[PDB]
Design a binder for this molecule. Structure first.
Ligand SMILES: O=C(O)/C=C(\C=C(/O)C(=O)O)C(=O)O
Length: 294
């Protein structure tokens, strides 16, 4: 254990109110909880030790920004121990669903227990700066024995997309891509990375993506105009396959801490019409995470 003070703050403690008002039932489909470490320790394999960011803080943020629901995504700092994430879902009293990280050896019963606890998929992280090992064969095997209706969430960088194509084509359930596979948004909406990512989207009908993280992808900083110009055409072209999230509490972003109000204000830039906003924030995430309500 490290004290909270000793650990890394990566979020804005007093974020601006967004100028944009999200519609009723809006889902922040990419967020995390960290600890609280006193009850839920970090993984021995964690590559960062963040400050506590618990459910009460997450819900306060959710309310402040005007969102109705969250998808709480197991963070790499907690490894395959989903306890913190599971506790947050429990505390959300129905307003949250989850994504887990699992030992590929996890048994049928343990997966069932994760489903009851509100998980609707598992995450595969191909960023070496976050996770050392990524056994594709084992990943494929676990993906083939998930509870009915689960998907897989995949996080990778643009420079390994081509290498990952055979793996992704073999995944036997739907796929959600974190942060569009980190394209270089400086290139424009028809740049090399976006062309490659579109080839991936065009290969299977059931690949969804998060149109997220201008803070991570656009080194100019706010208003992140390159992200806006490069991402908006992608949203428009794949309107039925796009979801969105804040990425709060922004692990690893301590050197460029984003204002969540500004993060939310990207929404009407990449989704300029009411219909696009409703698809990205309500209809699409509902089909993935609350299909029983659709
Ligand atoms: O969580 C994200 O969306 C982004 C990052 C962190 C993780 O993926 C994680 O630790 O689980 C990152 O890019 O550092």
């Amino acid at each position: 254990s490290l004290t909270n003070d000793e650990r890394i703050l990566s979020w804005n403690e007093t974020p601006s109110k967004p100028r944009y008002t999200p519609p009723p039932g809006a889902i922040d489909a990419h967020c995390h909880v960290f600890g609280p470490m006193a009850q839920f320790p970090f993984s021995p394999k964690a590559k960062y030790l963040p400050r506590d960011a618990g459910p009460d803080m997450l819900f306060a943020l959710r309310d402040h920004l005007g969102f109705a629901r969250n998808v709480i995504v197991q963070a790499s700092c907690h490894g395959t121990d989903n306890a913190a994430t599971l506790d947050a879902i429990a505390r959300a009293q129905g307003k949250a669903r989850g994504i887990a990280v699992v030992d590929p050896a996890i048994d049928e019963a343990e997966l069932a227990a994760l489903h009851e606890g509100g998980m609707r998929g598992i995450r595969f992280n191909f960023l070496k700066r976050l996770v050392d090992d990524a056994p594709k064969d084992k990943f494929l095997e676990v993906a083939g024995r998930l509870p009915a209706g689960w998907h897989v969430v995949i996080y990778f960088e643009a420079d390994i997309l081509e290498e990952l194509r055979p793996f992704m084509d073999a995944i036997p359930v739907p796929i959600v891509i974190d942060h569009m596979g980190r394209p270089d948004v400086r290139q424009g909406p028809d740049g090399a990375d976006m062309k490659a990512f579109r080839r991936l989207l065009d290969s299977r009908e059931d690949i969804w993506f998060k149109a997220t993280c201008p803070d991570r992808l656009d080194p100019a900083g706010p208003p992140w105009d390159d992200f806006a110009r490069s991402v908006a055409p992608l949203v428009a072209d794949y309107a039925d396959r796009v979801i969105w999230g804040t990425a709060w509490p922004h692990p690893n972003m301590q050197d460029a801490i984003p204002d969540d109000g500004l993060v939310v204000d990207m929404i009407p830039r990449i989704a300029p019409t009411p219909e696009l906003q409703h698809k990205m924030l309500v209809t699409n995430p509902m089909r993935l995470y609350w299909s029983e309500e659709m």
